[PDB]
Amino acid sequence: RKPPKGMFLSQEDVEAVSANATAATTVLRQLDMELVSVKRQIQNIKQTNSALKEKLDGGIEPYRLPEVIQKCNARWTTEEQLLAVQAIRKYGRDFQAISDVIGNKSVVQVKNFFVNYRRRFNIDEVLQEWEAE
Amino acid sequence: PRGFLVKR
Amino acid sequence: SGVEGAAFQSRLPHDRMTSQEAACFPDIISGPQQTQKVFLFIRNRTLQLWLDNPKIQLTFEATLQQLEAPYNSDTVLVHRVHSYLERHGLINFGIYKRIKPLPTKKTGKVIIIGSGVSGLAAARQLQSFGMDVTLLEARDRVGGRVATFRKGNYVADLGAMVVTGLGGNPMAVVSKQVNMELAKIKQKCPLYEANGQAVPKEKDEMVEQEFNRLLEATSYLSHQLDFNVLNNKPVSLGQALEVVIQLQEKHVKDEQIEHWKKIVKTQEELKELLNKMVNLKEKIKELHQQYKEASEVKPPRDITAEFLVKSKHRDLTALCKEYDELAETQGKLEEKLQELEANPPSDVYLSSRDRQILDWHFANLEFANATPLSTLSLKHWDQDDDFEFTGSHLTVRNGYSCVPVALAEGLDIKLNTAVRQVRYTASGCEVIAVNTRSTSQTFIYKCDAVLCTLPLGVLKQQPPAVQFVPPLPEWKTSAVQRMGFGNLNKVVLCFDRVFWDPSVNLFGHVGSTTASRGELFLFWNLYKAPILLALVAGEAAGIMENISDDVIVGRCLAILKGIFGSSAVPQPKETVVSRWRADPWARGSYSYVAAGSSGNDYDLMAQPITPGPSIPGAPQPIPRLFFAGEHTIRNYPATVHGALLSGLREAGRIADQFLGAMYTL
Numbered sequence: 082r083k084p085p086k087g088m089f090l091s092q093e094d095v096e097a098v099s100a101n102a103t104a105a106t107t108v109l110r111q112l113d114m115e116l117v118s119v120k121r122q123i124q125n126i127k128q129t130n131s132a133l134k135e136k137l138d139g140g141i142e143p144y145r146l147p148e149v150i151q152k153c154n155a156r157w158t159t160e161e162q163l164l165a166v167q168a169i170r171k172y173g174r175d176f177q178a179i180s181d182v183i184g185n186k187s188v189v190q191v192k193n194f195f196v197n198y199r200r201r202f203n204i205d206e207v208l209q210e211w212e213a214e
Numbered sequence: 215p216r217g218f219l220v221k222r
Numbered sequence: 223s224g225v226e227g228a229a230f231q232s233r234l235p236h237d238r239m240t241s242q243e244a245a246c247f248p249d250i251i252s253g254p255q256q257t258q259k260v261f262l263f264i265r266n267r268t269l270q271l272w273l274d275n276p277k278i279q280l281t282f283e284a285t286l287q288q289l290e291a292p293y294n295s296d297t298v299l300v301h302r303v304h305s306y307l308e309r310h311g312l313i314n315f316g317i318y319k320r321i322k323p324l325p326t327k328k329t330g331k332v333i334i335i336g337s338g339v340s341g342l343a344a345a346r347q348l349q350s351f352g353m354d355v356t357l358l359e360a361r362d363r364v365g366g367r368v369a370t371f372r373k374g375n376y377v378a379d380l381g382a383m384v385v386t387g388l389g390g391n392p393m394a395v396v397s398k399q400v401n402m403e404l405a406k407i408k409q410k411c412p413l414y415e416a417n418g419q420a421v422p423k424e425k426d427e428m429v430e431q432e433f434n435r436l437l438e439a440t441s442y443l444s445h446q447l448d449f450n451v452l453n454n455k456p457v458s459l460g461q462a463l464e465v466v467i468q469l470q471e472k473h474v475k476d477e478q479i480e481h482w483k484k485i486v487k488t489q490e491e492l493k494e495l496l497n498k499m500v501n502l503k504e505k506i507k508e509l510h511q512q513y514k515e516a517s518e519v520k521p522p523r524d525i526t527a528e529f530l531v532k533s534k535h536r537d538l539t540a541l542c543k544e545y546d547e548l549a550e551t552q553g554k555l556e557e558k559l560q561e562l563e564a565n566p567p568s569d570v571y572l573s574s575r576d577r578q579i580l581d582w583h584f585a586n587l588e589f590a591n592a593t594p595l596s597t598l599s600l601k602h603w604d605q606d607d608d609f610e611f612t613g614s615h616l617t618v619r620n621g622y623s624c625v626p627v628a629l630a631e632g633l634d635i636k637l638n639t640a641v642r643q644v645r646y647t648a649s650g651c652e653v654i655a656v657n658t659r660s661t662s663q664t665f666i667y668k669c670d671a672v673l674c675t676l677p678l679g680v681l682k683q684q685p686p687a688v689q690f691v692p693p694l695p696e697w698k699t700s701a702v703q704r705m706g707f708g709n710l711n712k713v714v715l716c717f718d719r720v721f722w723d724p725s726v727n728l729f730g731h732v733g734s735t736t737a738s739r740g741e742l743f744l745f746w747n748l749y750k751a752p753i754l755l756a757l758v759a760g761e762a763a764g765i766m767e768n769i770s771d772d773v774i775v776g777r778c779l780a781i782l783k784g785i786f787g788s789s790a791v792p793q794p795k796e797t798v799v800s801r802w803r804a805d806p807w808a809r810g811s812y813s814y815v816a817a818g819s820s821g822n823d824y825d826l827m828a829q830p831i832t833p834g835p836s837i838p839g840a841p842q843p844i845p846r847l848f849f850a851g852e853h854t855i856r857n858y859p860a861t862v863h864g865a866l867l868s869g870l871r872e873a874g875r876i877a878d879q880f881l882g883a884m885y886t887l
């Protein structure tokens with residue numbers, strides 16, 4: 082029914098090695114050269130990845146901005162309103178980005194702002210100006 | 215034949 | 223044990239009628255199941271009786287005496303059974319005390335060529351049936367391929383040596399009849415490489431296991447995959463093993479390839495992640511500078527200038543978020559590569575050291591079949607497996623020849639008589655022989671029938687050593703050519719002292735190359751005296767015959783020195799070297815199933831020859847030329863017991879032919 086354990090013999094493999102006189106060593110050569118090919122291909126990409134790792138050395142430590150934990154506020158200062166309109170011009174509908182720029186407004190408050198000031202800040206125009214880019 | 219094999 | 227145990231010990235199913243029984247008792251087997259069971263019991267019980275005491279003749283009277291009801295009620299059936307068993311040598315075979323001294327006058331005349339075991343077996347039987355029997359032997363001794371060297375206290379068999387188990391072995395009966403000192407063989411066989419260093423139990427076990435597994439694989443190739451024809455030529459076992467080994471090497475390389483192929487797929491996935499990470503660190507370095515410059519603009523500042531600072535702050539932490547998630551992925555892949563590289567698949571399938579130890583195992587197989595594996599039939603080399611005996615193998619400690627010699631007692635044996643021509647016709651046979659000493663001194667033997675027990679190597683000779691008149695029919699000679707006749711030699715080393723492990727029966731030696739794997743690869747310690755026995759098998763067997771004894775014994779000592787110590791191995795007092803292929807009365811050792819042959823050829827060999835009629839238009843003649851011998855018994859070839867059984871077989875057939883079968887009514 083099936084070969085013994087640790088023994089691999091498919092009908093296909095038999096016909097391939099018994100095809101002719103030295104079809105045995107021919108197949109064993111292809112795989113011997115395939116092994117060399119893939120082995121030096123490893124060292125090649127291992128060399129490339131080693132050089133790319135030295136450029137990433139140090140990480141992004143000199144470029145990290147300290148933790149600015151600030152309490153959320155309900156009131157919209159004139160300042161905050163102006164930041165918002167500019168944030169809409171730059172970020173469109175990304176309510177998360179806008180929220181982070183202003184700093185003290187939650188993602189829902191940003192969505193509220195869109196509805197509340199829609200007329201007074203021509204937010205339609207500001208959004209279509211962002212779309213043109 | 216087989217029967218003569220050592221180390222069975 | 224019981225009646226069923228006797229059927230087993232006689233190689234018969236206890237609960238079923240055989241083909242040979244169906245022929246002699248067609249009334250019973252075609253009849254009701256009730257009768258068959260009575261027959262089977264009668265048969266079995268009679269066998270039991272004979273087996274329980276094989277040193278005395280079992281008569282019909284003694285048999286009926288010890289039967290119960292309703293078995294002893296039908297005395298003709300009991301007689302038919304006893305006679306059948308007696309005729310075919312299942313009871314009253316070998317050397318036993320005869321109750322009724324032999325019949326006054328003989329009937330029919332049979333010439334038996336060869337006094338090997340097969341010949342001797344038949345001879346006794348035919349004489350027991352009251353026929354005139356004469357054996358013609360070319361040698362100056364009986365036994366033929368059962369050769370036993372004797373000198374002083376040294377006793378070593380140059381031919382047959384091992385009894386392959388007693389469970390069903392007719393030699394078990396023989397051993398009870400003859401003073402045979404049967405010692406068991408301990409299965410442990412330590413190997414020793416070319417240098418003399420023992421093979422570590424780690425290697426030993428893995429190679430042996432690999433050997434057995436490679437064998438099973440060839441068996442799988444043959445029966446399941448049907449790999450039996452290659453370029454119109456029949457596939458040998460040697461071919462098949464190579465093919466299997468190559469596929470095991472191919473797989474090893476296949477495994478390595480897809481393992482490294484796994485590494486490059488991950489290494490190249492990492493390469494793309496590093497490019498993304500480098501391009502992001504570049505944009506972070508730039509964006510930080512931008513935010514820096516936005517903060518340098520000291521307050522107070524308008525809202526656009528304030529927004530810029532805030533904007534670049536968000537943009538920078540967003541890109542700092544991504545790089546942190548990508549350093550996470552880098553950590554995952556970086557260890558996943560250390561995972562796959564930590565556990566590599568097999569470096570090689572087998573090393574040069576391995577392949578050498580595997581070659582010893584092939585030598586074992588080449589010894590067992592007495593031939594290069596390139597000659598054996600893949601499909602059939604092991605066709606007699608089903609009929610192996612049960613129990614541990616034994617050796618004859620007092621020498622095997624004791625058996626032929628004991629069988630030869632009370633028999634007309636003409637030694638030094640070399641048969642040259644066999645002539646057989648409708649009216650009878652004449653055998654022309656000569657004296658081996660003065661080869662011009664000619665003899666003529668007239669007989670009703672000839673039993674030929676010539677070795678297959680002899681029958682094979684070209685040009686013929688024995689001429690058949692008329693020539694043997696095409697079907698017979700084709701069988702002779704097709705069949706394989708192997709070669710296996712022994713070197714007997716006799717010392718003054720035991721320098722080996724006295725509790726070890728046999729130890730191997732690993733040769734340097736594949737070419738020399740058979741050469742002195744095995745050593746036997748079996749006998750009372752300090753005797754070591756070295757095998758020469760495989761391709762090496764044939765080539766070592768063209769080499770002098772001194773050189774052979776030289777290489778023997780060389781090896782033993784390497785294993786036991788240069789000063790632990792003394793000079794041998796007596797040495798013998800067999801040359802079975804060169805021996806004109808053997809022309810080889812024993813038969814094997816050659817590639818292109820099958821088990822059916824063995825049957826063809828046992829088939830008797832019936833001559834043509836003298837006068838044209840005369841009735842179909844009696845069969846005149848009969849064949850026994852090791853090469854004629856499909857289920858037990860290449861053995862003593864096989865030859866023995868074939869002898870019994872033919873005696874039965876001859877007696878049936880010339881004395882008539884009274885038991886078939």
Ligand SMILES: Cc1cc2nc3c(=O)[nH]c(=O)nc-3n(C[C@H](O)[C@H](O)[C@H](O)COP(=O)(O)OP(=O)(O)OC[C@H]3O[C@@H](n4cnc5c(N)ncnc54)[C@H](O)[C@@H]3O)c2cc1C
Nearest residue numbers: 336338340360366367381382383384641811851852861862
């Ligand atoms: C090295 C070796 C080891 C063996 N070990 C074992 C073993 O361990 N166990 C086992 O069961 N079997 C073993 N055998 C096999 C066994 O020995 C034989 O199968 C058996 O002895 C054959 O008996 P035979 O009567 O068929 O042939 P033989 O015993 O050869 O009888 C044939 C006879 O014919 C004679 N003869 C030949 N030509 C002529 C002629 N022209 N005129 C007259 N006579 C002639 C021969 O001299 C010989 O006596 C071994 C064989 C060998 C070679």
